[PDB]
């Protein structure tokens, strides 16, 4: 007992965390969350419009989106 | 002189080695065809024999080719084979229907891997990340080092593809380059 | 390079887990195969023909990390880390029950085959149940104080020899509940026991990369320890590997990390084989059991290999 | 080593090429190392320059 | 001492250039409709000069192994304070650098700029750089030794007298960087805007004799790091007792065999020589 | 059969070159490890 | 699939993260789009993670590692590597050259057509080991102080090529506190504005307008502080002989 | 370097017109050989090799740039690759055998010879061959090449 | 004591002197497999140019070579018998004591390997076929690409 008592603490670790079906992945999933609206509000708000020099490294992206405004519209 | 009364004998020259052999018994270096001095980074292409020991400038034909890249580079593929010595028998058979199906699944494969790739180009897949983002590991056993020839810890690699944000554009405007030019010419069997 | 059996190719791969393949066993006649892998399912191949998945078994929670067979092929035992055993019938596709009493990891299990049919399981709570597959409930339980990660029935079917994390092959009477005896000499923790298929004797490998051949029958000294085969060292994940001997008992293989199959001589001693194939750790190394030169090597791969012994 | 001078019945000079490689430098290892002669590169070169005048 | 802020936020606010154009581009943010005279001659002063006593200190850099130099710093404009997380310090010779970035992380590139302004290239070690616009005087030779042995540590100082040009040498890459940075639109004694850009090449053939001798001696300095000293003993030749080493082991037994280099450098576990 | 152990334990002759990495700085073979193995030596 | 890096460049720690980009960034060579790999540090640094910034391609043909761009086999520059031991490799760097250059290279190795420099060291180390009236000296009123406290300025005499400010601002910094240092090694001359004239003072009357300065022997003195000019070249001959007939 | 870029790019703008033009080549190989840039009009003549790999007259321009600068090895490497390229084409061959009896190599003469008549000429090269060994006195060796 | 074994190979004739004063187990072991006819079609499936032409393997590899004492016999380092230069003879082996039927041969100096591997022979005839061996193209493995075989061997005494 006193002998393997560590060699027993960190088999059932292991095994518990290789094993465990909370994950079954590697990593513990979870269900994606709602933000809140004030989040969203504060980006929007930041942004602008996109004339800051700071947003140019969302520029490529915002512009890129515009493939997308057909369905923001529908 | 013979053996094994070679006991003070000394050669000075492939004369004295004959039709060569250096002389194990001597306690000298000898060199029976001729000293190599040195080779002083030269940029020749090596000399080098064929299979019944003659000077080869097939050599030239294939530079710059690939080693199972079909030359013909020699007056022996202007005979007509059935007159060419080193044959008997020629088979002139089709392949069989197993290595006709080994051929047709090993070109299928390579065709539909770039038939998903043309696929792929002609329909960008509306947004383009993939939910399977699985992580691949890499053994990694390194070599030594850039000054350092002491030998360190192998090395185990997670590799995963980055998530790339939906909605950018490609990153990068083409460019027009002029094509490069052909693979060697081959010799003109006329 | 002669052809020694009735097979498509002198070897083949089976794939289509999108897990590890922590267990694979062949069926008594050696002509199907179940493969019990951590994607929580096992697949179910048919060796002859040419080869054929004819079976998908689902309903387990976590990692399959041990089968075994009836002793006629027509129910399926199963034991995984969802800490349940299971039974499925193979007619139907379809889990007839699952045993439920172990409270941790359920490592091993193996199934008594003669006389009356019985279920032995090691799991990490320190118990070794003892199951009848009819009720869902526990005949009985051996209550150790260390996780047991082998079990093995012998022949004579009422001593259990199970092997965990205090290294010792602790044999045990049923009857009693209670040791008998325990041989001695492995260092890590036993991740294969085995009898051979004329039972007198035992093979074990244990974390130590030693695969040891210990005497079953009851007359022996006291040093019960055959031979200590080497070759297969254990890489860097502390998989539960599995061997086996071969049908005639003359061989006996293990599985190694390096993605190798190791076979000696289990009279000898002398490196058979070591064939190599898989990119993971080879968790399963199974002979055939109707005598053919057969190997099936299972591993870490996603995929297994079923090899002939020419 | 190439060359073997032998006396036969009359007792003359009798030089005999082991290989074949005295009169050609085809199947000669070292017919890569023939550096000609200065006089004979002018020599040549003055004949492409008279060519070129021509 | 912690890292002291050199100017404050209510001034390091973002906002835009000065209107020169007609309507103002917020894809490339400049100004358009205007002119291109206007932007060739303006080169405005320095906001600010940074201090080695007064300012250089310590920060969260100081705490994390391996991150760069403060660029804001060296510019003299950085409100951080302690809490910037790039050193607030001049390199020592200590300081080296890969090629592939500068002394402030900013990536160094295949080429020049075609004013030779900017981070600099990989393609040439320059630590040379290249101060223009400078007021002739009788002392500027004293002001350029003063100001820049205050921003590092000089291999060599060459200041043109005819067109005001001082070009100042380094012996470390990183205070070159640091001091082209620190000292760009900066005044020296006189109320004037420095070009300091990356020299180039020195046509002076003693230059770029000496160049090219500390080019083999670095490199040089590299393959006796690589080679164990005996071989370099041996390669060199430069004494007597190494030599009749090397004569003796490349004879290895046999006299008058003098073994190739190749055979006799061979390195590896188990090739030819036990010096291996 | 060239993987019986003695076509194995036969070794290659004759005496070394005195004068196979597909990387440029090393060796890299695909492996396939567990997740919970890499993360757990990685921690 | 798997970048060519360096042991110093990848991280401490044995078990990888990386993240693999295709198409990611530029070659800095050649201006191609390659497959990045970026790994995070060792010490969480703010900067960014560590990444390929060269193709393979262009490292196979410049033999670097992908992320430092230093010389797989030494640990040098690839542009000092190559110049000391220029016998390697050239290359190009025009516009399309180089990307015409990039992309026939790279199809040439992968379709298939296309432990070399040991020689070229061995034979760099013997390069490096093959090595390249009478003016009367000081007196007295050479190395007596003058009277005029406002001259501060000492004056150093036969300046070699090879003669570094930073070691002659340590030796002046050992004895005194310098204001100034301005070494000319065009016409071989130095001035010296120290700060304190007492330091001055005594460091000049320990040197006696002699010094040995790493096997350069040098001639201080006091002179008024004079902009060096572009002097004649019998001028700096003369500085020159002036300098090295400090030492009889 | 003005005038030679404003030359060069001249010439590379007929290039990019019509590359089927050997003049275009030509003329910009013989005014880089007047710069004395052998490395210019080597590459030069080596893009044009490309274009028309099997032209007699470029392969020989080619040559007769190297052997009038007298880079003797670099001739003799384009003489073993056009003999290789166009086996059947005997002005390749002559010159060859030309060039190597100028240089004095009689048994370098005799080795292209050789490799020839493996190739197994016409009448004239046989000839031409038996003419060389009655020019240097080698009655026997040309009774070998009859037979 | 010399003993003649002539070579057939596929680029001329070598010619053996073989010493049966010195290494006489190894020689004689040489003209039983000569005799036997163990060498016939036996290609040399290594050349290392400056180095070393090996062959005498039957199956091609290297890994093989049986020769008439079983499998292995001792080494005979006899003091006297340097690998002094090109063309001479000795036993392949994988380590001491380990002498089986593939021949080393130098084409070079190669004094190294005294102390460890049995000189036995030398070449009387062919030398320059020998060189010729020596030049042929190989490939990362040594093997060469283009293939030399040793037709027949005999024995001439
Ligand atoms: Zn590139
Ligand atoms: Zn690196």
Known sequence: IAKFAQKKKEWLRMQRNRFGEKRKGGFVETQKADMPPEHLRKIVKDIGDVSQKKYTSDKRSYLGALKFMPHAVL | PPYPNRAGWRPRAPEDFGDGGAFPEIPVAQYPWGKNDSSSKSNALVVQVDSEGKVDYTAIARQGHSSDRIIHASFKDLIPLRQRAEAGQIDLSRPSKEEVEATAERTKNALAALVSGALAAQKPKNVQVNTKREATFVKYTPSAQMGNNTKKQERIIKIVERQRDPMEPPKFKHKKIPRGPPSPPPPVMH | TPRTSNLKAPLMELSGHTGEIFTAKFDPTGTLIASGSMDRTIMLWRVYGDCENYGVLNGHKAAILDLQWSRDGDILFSASADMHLASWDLTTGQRIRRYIGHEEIINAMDVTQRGEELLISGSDDGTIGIWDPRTKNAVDYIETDFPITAVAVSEAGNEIYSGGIDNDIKVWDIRKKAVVHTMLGHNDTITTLRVSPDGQQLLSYAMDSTARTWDIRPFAPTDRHIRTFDGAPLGLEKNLIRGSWSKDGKKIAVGAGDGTVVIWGSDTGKLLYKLPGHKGTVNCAEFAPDGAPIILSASSDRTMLLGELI | GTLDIIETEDGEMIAVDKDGTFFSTANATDFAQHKPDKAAVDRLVADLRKAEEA | RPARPQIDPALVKSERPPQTGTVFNIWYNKWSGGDREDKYLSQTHAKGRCNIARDSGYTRADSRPGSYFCLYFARGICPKGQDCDYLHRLPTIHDIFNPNVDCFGRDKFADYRDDMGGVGSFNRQNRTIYVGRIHVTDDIEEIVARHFAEWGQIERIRVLNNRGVAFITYTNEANAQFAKEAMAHQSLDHNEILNVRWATADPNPLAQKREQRRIEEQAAEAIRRALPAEFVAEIEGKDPEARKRRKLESSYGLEGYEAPDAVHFARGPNAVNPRG | ?43 | DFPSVCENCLPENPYVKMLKEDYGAECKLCTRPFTVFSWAGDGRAHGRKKRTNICLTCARLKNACQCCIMDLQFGLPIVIRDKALELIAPGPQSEINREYFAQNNERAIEEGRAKTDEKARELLRRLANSKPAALPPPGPKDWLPPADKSIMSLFITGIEDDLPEWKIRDFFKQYGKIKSLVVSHMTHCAFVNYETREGAEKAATELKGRAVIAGCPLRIRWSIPRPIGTMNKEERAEMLRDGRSAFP | KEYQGRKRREFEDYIRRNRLRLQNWFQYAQWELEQKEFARARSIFERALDVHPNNTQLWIRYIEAELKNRNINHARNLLDRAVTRLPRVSKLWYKYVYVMEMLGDIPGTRQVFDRWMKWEPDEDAWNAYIKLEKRYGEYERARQIFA | MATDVALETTMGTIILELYNQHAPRTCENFKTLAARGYYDGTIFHRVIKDFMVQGGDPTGTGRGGRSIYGDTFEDEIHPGLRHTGAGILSMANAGPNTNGSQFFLTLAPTPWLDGKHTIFGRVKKGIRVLQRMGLVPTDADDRPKTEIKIIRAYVVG
Not at chain 6, 22 to 31: I, Q
Request: aromatic content about 12%.
């Open chain 6, 1 to 43: 059969v060239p993987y019986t152990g003695e076509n194995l334990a036969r070794p290659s002759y004759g005496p070394a070159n005195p004068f196979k990495n597909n990387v440029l700085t090393g060796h890299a073979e695909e492996m396939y490890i567990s997740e919970a193995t890499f993360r757990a030596k990685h921690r």
